[PDB]
Amino acid sequence: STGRFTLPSEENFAEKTKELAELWGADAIRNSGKKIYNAYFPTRAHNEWITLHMDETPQVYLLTDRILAESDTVDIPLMESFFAEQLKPNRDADPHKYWEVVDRTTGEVVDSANWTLDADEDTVHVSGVAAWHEYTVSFLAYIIWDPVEMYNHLTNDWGDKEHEIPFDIYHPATRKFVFDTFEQWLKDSPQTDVVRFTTFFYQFTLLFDEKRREKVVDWFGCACTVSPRALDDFEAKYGYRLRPEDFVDGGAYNSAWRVPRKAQRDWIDFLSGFVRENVKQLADMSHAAGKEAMMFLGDQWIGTEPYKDGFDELGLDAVVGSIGDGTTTRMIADIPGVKYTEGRFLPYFFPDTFYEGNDPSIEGLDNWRKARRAILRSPISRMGYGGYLSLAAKFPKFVDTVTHIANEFRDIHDRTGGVAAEGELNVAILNSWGKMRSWMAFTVAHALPNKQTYSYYGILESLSGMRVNVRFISFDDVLAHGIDSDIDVIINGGPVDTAFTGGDVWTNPKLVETVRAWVRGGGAFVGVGEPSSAPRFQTGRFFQLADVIGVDEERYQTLSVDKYFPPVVPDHFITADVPVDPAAREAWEQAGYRIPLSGCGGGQSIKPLGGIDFGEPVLNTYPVNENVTLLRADGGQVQLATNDYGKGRGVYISGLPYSAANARLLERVLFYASHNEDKYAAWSSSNPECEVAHFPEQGLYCVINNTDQPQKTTVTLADGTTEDFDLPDSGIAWR
Amino acid sequence: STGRFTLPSEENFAEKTKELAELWGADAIRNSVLALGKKIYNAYFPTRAHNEWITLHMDETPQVYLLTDRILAESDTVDIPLMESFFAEQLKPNRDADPHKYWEVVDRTTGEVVDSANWTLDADEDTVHVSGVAAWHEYTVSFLAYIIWDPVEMYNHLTNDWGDKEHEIPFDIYHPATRKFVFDTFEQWLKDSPQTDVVRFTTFFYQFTLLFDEKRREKVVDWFGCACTVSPRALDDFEAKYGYRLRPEDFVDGGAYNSAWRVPRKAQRDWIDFLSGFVRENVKQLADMSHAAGKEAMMFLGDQWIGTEPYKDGFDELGLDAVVGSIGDGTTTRMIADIPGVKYTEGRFLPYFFPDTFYEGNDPSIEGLDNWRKARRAILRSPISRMGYGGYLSLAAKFPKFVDTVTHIANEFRDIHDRTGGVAAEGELNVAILNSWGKMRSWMAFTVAHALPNKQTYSYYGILESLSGMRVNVRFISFDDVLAHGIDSDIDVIINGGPVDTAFTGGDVWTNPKLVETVRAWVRGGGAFVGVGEPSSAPRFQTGRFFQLADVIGVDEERYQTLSVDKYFPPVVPDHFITADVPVDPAAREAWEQAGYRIPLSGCGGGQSIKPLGGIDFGEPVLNTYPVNENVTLLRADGGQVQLATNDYGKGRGVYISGLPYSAANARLLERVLFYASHNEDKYAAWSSSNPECEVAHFPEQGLYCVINNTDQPQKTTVTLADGTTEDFDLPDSGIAWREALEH
Numbered sequence A: 001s002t003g004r005f006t007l008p009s010e011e012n013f014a015e016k017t018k019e020l021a022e023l024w025g026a027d028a029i030r031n032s033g034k035k036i037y038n039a040y041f042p043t044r045a046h047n048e049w050i051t052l053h054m055d056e057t058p059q060v061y062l063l064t065d066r067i068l069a070e071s072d073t074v075d076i077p078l079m080e081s082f083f084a085e086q087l088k089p090n091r092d093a094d095p096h097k098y099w100e101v102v103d104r105t106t107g108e109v110v111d112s113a114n115w116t117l118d119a120d121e122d123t124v125h126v127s128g129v130a131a132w133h134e135y136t137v138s139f140l141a142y143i144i145w146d147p148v149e150m151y152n153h154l155t156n157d158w159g160d161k162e163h164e165i166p167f168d169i170y171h172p173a174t175r176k177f178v179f180d181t182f183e184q185w186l187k188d189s190p191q192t193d194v195v196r197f198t199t200f201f202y203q204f205t206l207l208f209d210e211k212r213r214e215k216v217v218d219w220f221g222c223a224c225t226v227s228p229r230a231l232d233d234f235e236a237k238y239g240y241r242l243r244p245e246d247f248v249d250g251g252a253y254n255s256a257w258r259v260p261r262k263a264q265r266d267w268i269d270f271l272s273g274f275v276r277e278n279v280k281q282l283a284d285m286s287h288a289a290g291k292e293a294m295m296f297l298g299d300q301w302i303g304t305e306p307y308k309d310g311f312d313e314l315g316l317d318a319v320v321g322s323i324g325d326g327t328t329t330r331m332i333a334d335i336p337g338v339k340y341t342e343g344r345f346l347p348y349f350f351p352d353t354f355y356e357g358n359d360p361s362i363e364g365l366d367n368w369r370k371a372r373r374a375i376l377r378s379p380i381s382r383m384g385y386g387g388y389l390s391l392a393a394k395f396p397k398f399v400d401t402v403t404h405i406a407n408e409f410r411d412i413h414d415r416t417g418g419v420a421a422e423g424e425l426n427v428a429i430l431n432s433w434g435k436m437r438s439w440m441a442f443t444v445a446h447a448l449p450n451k452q453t454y455s456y457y458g459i460l461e462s463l464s465g466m467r468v469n470v471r472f473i474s475f476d477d478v479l480a481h482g483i484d485s486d487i488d489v490i491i492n493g494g495p496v497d498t499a500f501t502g503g504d505v506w507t508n509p510k511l512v513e514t515v516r517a518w519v520r521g522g523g524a525f526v527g528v529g530e531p532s533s534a535p536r537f538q539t540g541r542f543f544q545l546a547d548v549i550g551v552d553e554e555r556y557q558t559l560s561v562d563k564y565f566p567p568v569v570p571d572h573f574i575t576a577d578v579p580v581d582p583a584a585r586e587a588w589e590q591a592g593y594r595i596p597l598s599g600c601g602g603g604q605s606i607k608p609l610g611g612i613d614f615g616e617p618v619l620n621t622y623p624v625n626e627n628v629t630l631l632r633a634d635g636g637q638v639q640l641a642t643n644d645y646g647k648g649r650g651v652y653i654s655g656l657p658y659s660a661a662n663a664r665l666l667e668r669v670l671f672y673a674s675h676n677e678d679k680y681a682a683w684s685s686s687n688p689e690c691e692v693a694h695f696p697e698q699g700l701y702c703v704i705n706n707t708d709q710p711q712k713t714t715v716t717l718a719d720g721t722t723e724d725f726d727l728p729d730s731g732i733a734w735r
Numbered sequence B: 001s002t003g004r005f006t007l008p009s010e011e012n013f014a015e016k017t018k019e020l021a022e023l024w025g026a027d028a029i030r031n032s033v034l035a036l037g038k039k040i041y042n043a044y045f046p047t048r049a050h051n052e053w054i055t056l057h058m059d060e061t062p063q064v065y066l067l068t069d070r071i072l073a074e075s076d077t078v079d080i081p082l083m084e085s086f087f088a089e090q091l092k093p094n095r096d097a098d099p100h101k102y103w104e105v106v107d108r109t110t111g112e113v114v115d116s117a118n119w120t121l122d123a124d125e126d127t128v129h130v131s132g133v134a135a136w137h138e139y140t141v142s143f144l145a146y147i148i149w150d151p152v153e154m155y156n157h158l159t160n161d162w163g164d165k166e167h168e169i170p171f172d173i174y175h176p177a178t179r180k181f182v183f184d185t186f187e188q189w190l191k192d193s194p195q196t197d198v199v200r201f202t203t204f205f206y207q208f209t210l211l212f213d214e215k216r217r218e219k220v221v222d223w224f225g226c227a228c229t230v231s232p233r234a235l236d237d238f239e240a241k242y243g244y245r246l247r248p249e250d251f252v253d254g255g256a257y258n259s260a261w262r263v264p265r266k267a268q269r270d271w272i273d274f275l276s277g278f279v280r281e282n283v284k285q286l287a288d289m290s291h292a293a294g295k296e297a298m299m300f301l302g303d304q305w306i307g308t309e310p311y312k313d314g315f316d317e318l319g320l321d322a323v324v325g326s327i328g329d330g331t332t333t334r335m336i337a338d339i340p341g342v343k344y345t346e347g348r349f350l351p352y353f354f355p356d357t358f359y360e361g362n363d364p365s366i367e368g369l370d371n372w373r374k375a376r377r378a379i380l381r382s383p384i385s386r387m388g389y390g391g392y393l394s395l396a397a398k399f400p401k402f403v404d405t406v407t408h409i410a411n412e413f414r415d416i417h418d419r420t421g422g423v424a425a426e427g428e429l430n431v432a433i434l435n436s437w438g439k440m441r442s443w444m445a446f447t448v449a450h451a452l453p454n455k456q457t458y459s460y461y462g463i464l465e466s467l468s469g470m471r472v473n474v475r476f477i478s479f480d481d482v483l484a485h486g487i488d489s490d491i492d493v494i495i496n497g498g499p500v501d502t503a504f505t506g507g508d509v510w511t512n513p514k515l516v517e518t519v520r521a522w523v524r525g526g527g528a529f530v531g532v533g534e535p536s537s538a539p540r541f542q543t544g545r546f547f548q549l550a551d552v553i554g555v556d557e558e559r560y561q562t563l564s565v566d567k568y569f570p571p572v573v574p575d576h577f578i579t580a581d582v583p584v585d586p587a588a589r590e591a592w593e594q595a596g597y598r599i600p601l602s603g604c605g606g607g608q609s610i611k612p613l614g615g616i617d618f619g620e621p622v623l624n625t626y627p628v629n630e631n632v633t634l635l636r637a638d639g640g641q642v643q644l645a646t647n648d649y650g651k652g653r654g655v656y657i658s659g660l661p662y663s664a665a666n667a668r669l670l671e672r673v674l675f676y677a678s679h680n681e682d683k684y685a686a687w688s689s690s691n692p693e694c695e696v697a698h699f700p701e702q703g704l705y706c707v708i709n710n711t712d713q714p715q716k717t718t719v720t721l722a723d724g725t726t727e728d729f730d731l732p733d734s735g736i737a738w739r740e741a742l743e744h
């Protein structure tokens, strides 16, 4: 137990650095005979360069607000809705060539002969248009303040501190400056052992409004990656010209939730080739200087595509990433083609958690736990923290917390040999993106699930630390090669008309044939939210695989058809670990079920059984026939159901916020749907708040407490014997 | 006080009949005595009650297109059971009419019709064998079925557990033989019925969609539905006349069966036009024969009423003397009351005199008065001529509290009529409900089964129930009306309500720029647009705009296309004209004030209240509504979405309401929305009740107003008159008070 830990550094704290490095077994130190990390920012920190070449800043297509015409002319302000300190209209590149004015009421592009850019203000004058339509402008804008340095400035209130102007290496002058500068920096940095690229060339979509608030964000977004030259080169390489609409996307800005369009994939391929070649050059230069190249998974990471084939050819030594939860841990941990991986764990060493009176040991251990369950399934090589080491030195409780965490992290390695725990089922998440977005489904802002996303993000968070093997596949994979014979369960989840359910791909009969035949043969299909949904295709069928999962969503087209709900089965394998208050169940049992009534169907429980948090409701789901097993169908609709389908099974879940109870529910769903109930017992914890990781090649299993509470649990082993555990706060026991 | 009241009666009950007729001031008696001199009603059932005829001509029963279950093929052949999902006592596949000409097998997975060469109907079994199909697709048959049990007679049989009695077989006058039988039989009946004064046709020729399943439960219902109206000959004649052949699909409609909630298709309107021409011709003949015999013809608004179209032009040319209908609530009262083209209208009130309500230990007087209150508030806005009850008088006679309640109700019904002269109260605003159907479905939007709103519909039906007794003039207009002629210059407020992709919101009509132009210009000019649920919604048309008029009402629905755009909610304004009568809960309000609003957070927007204010029942949620900009006024935006908002739009205003179950409080909320959105706040006070549990009806031409208590509790209220003076009332349980007003 020595190493695998990264210490942050600071001002005149050499004494205490030596002491905390030795107590924590740190083998590396990061900058604000150890391994020395220095962050590198290829597209900023050189205002002396970019102010003399201001047409080489990165650029972005922006969509104005919708302006109502009240006659045959309308004026459209360009900048009223954007942060003028970050963004500026590009007046250099011919607006009639590079911009588009759109009648949003008809979807038609307004002829360029019908609009002008005012000479003295940032306003477009549209003429010859229709009264009472809404108009917008899609315009090129220079990004004049690095989005992340800007976010840090605002967040920390840096006041009048000079704003860092970002620059785009797509232009040869800037590219040469960047590489010459890095060449010299390498020479000037003989003490640096690891170049921590934070990050590379293109920032994820991060645009601010006129009130200095975030306006548009997408951790995967490609908005901030255009220029007149790139657009013209793209047309030459791909053989058609992109519209501004191909970037602003009606105001959606190509959110990862949108069903991906050819133009998006083409643009990703275009940037990717460019970014990767230049990242490889940086890595090679780093290597020729005797240093390792480490990439931060975030910020300017667009075009790297860590999960696409070829990432290995970059020769990056490492990826480091932000550890917020199990899902975000897996995003880092599962990346192929680097030598090692690193988590930057919480809390960051900065006053918002390190104030007098606070116990930062608690955050520190929660973060360890959320990530630990995922680390057992997919180990990360190294751990470390960032920020002010002197701030964290004040809190002796937390210093102790770290000694414990670093020791445990290292003991896992020493015991495990960096081997993943054994997975008990092979589960595949099917969506439009597949492997290229492994652990990335449902994210908008990194680590920040919200009202609209948490009912689906919980599926990944549950899976992140679960005792099963998770893979990510696309509709393209399935249509080209069928379903791999080693897969036990397919999960399709999300709202209608997204990348995550799949949109009109579900009207492709080859897809439906493939999934139906595989389930009939013994496969297992789990649909969450609006799985397999296709609007309008069939008047009487919204979820195209409703026959598989036993459930459809009423869309107000079939109200004339009475819906008959079979009685709910409250005692079932899937819900076996759900506690239900006896008085709640009694009330449910006593109130009974609706009697058939004209135009209202029948059989819906008059009171809810309850007991399970399913998150956001999917309104008016109903069972397709009375042979479907309803497990929860409260409030006149369906939350949880299972259906036999030849030799296989379908399961419907309306939504699934992460909690230990809901992860147990999903785990049971996975064993049940795959007809593997008999396989569930081996290497399981009786208590849902604990989890078991089995390591057979090492003849070993561990059990973890995912809470800060004492946990009592009984572990059932393969041979059928049981073991009682009484685990302390965040405990771990090995047998 | 006597008259305008129809009493039911029965055999061996002349004395109780005479007494109650006198007590209730009844002027009519309903068969189910003759010496009393009352107007005698007799029910007539044109299309049933003659098994002796139809058993001899069974191919003249009415028919329906039925859709089977979806059957999964697991190879290139598949067998489809025709009858496994239907009630075999009610429905029989039609084997007489060439199935290859009249039926369709459909691959539901692709939408494709299977070549009729690839399928055969089993000679011995009600099963279709299909070959040359794709494995792993679902297949269905759409087939013609004879209806061998009258749906309503069957409903009554099952409901009343008649077990044994013979099933009445219905018949279809589209066939000349049956048509002659029906007319000759009526000619005969009239001769045999010299005592009858009013023929109560219950009803005419075509039963509303009412189909049962193999478990003897309702399977499919639509009070407006045309399912039970087809025949080989009618389908073939339609093709000749309209120049195109209807597919079985134009009826089964993918399993929707042409629900009134579906955006109407041309094929539906053509079929209604076709049926209605034939039904109306024959109803006119029945009415003419009645009139020639010295009798009146009265039509029940219900059961076999398909093709009559009481709200379509030409209804008056039938010469029907009356329409009678079931009083279920205010909305169903207005369905009857607003019918033009008859001499008088009648309500049959609740409870029905039957053992399900008249049983020992039950108090049917409470239901009787509740039913009267719900209808009375609507009757003030649109009078009906008569009331009455149905069923077994001998049952009602055993409940003296009930009998006395009826005496009170009859006297009050007549007093209202005498005081107002049968004239509607003054309406204080002109409100138009806009949907795909318009006038022909007046008071009929949101209905599936008559008077039975459910989880899926009540959030919208409550709009009509609120309006049904409200002090405003309500009309129903269609998108065709607006596109053809603009918005009538007298309209103050347009309401558009319902879920996306329905007749009630309108579907893709909202992608027609002429409609959007017309409504926007009108609101900008001082109009008022109230959108409920998913108003003006059109899916997929614009990635960043779902409600096409989101700019007018200030609210849109997030459809998971725009999650990258941070949503910023302005602070909620809890004190506002619209919400002025919502009861204040200080535990809720202080909890909401203290908890404050979300701070901006990446990918999560900001400004949403962390705790809900509450206080208003908006029914079914519309998930993820948000304000389009921070100049919209949020009135309720609890739980990270929007329930209630107003937006200024030039001279006019838009208002968004996520849903509106009926209650006194919500009817007041809607009423205040109408006055506010139309910039008519200072018109609000004249002829109003401070207390929302009461309502006011002003009759300028009679120099009167009244105030009514819509509850069974005492209610104190202050009425405000036009001259700004007020009067205080202490109204008893279900009461009414009349006062003088300046005569005009």
Ligand SMILES: CC(=O)N[C@@H]1[C@@H](O)[C@@H](O)[C@@H](CO)O[C@@H]1O
Residues within 6 Å of the ligand: A148, A151, A297, A298, A299, A322, A446, B602
């Ligand atoms: C992993 C990653 O990209 N982290 C970034 C962080 O560096 C900062 O840019 C922030 C702005 O809201 O967005 C993310 O959290």
Ligand SMILES: CC(=O)N[C@@H]1[C@@H](O)[C@@H](O)[C@@H](CO)O[C@@H]1O
Residues within 6 Å of the ligand: A598, B152, B155, B301, B302, B303, B326, B450
């Ligand atoms: C008004 C009207 O048509 N009433 C009918 C009633 O007569 C009966 O047919 C019932 C069957 O569910 O459906 C409706 O309530």
Ligand SMILES: [Mg+2]
Residues within 6 Å of the ligand: A081, A209, B629
């Ligand atoms: Mg704005």
Ligand SMILES: [Mg+2]
Residues within 6 Å of the ligand: A239, A240, A241
């Ligand atoms: Mg070209």
Ligand SMILES: [Mg+2]
Residues within 6 Å of the ligand: B490
């Ligand atoms: Mg007027």
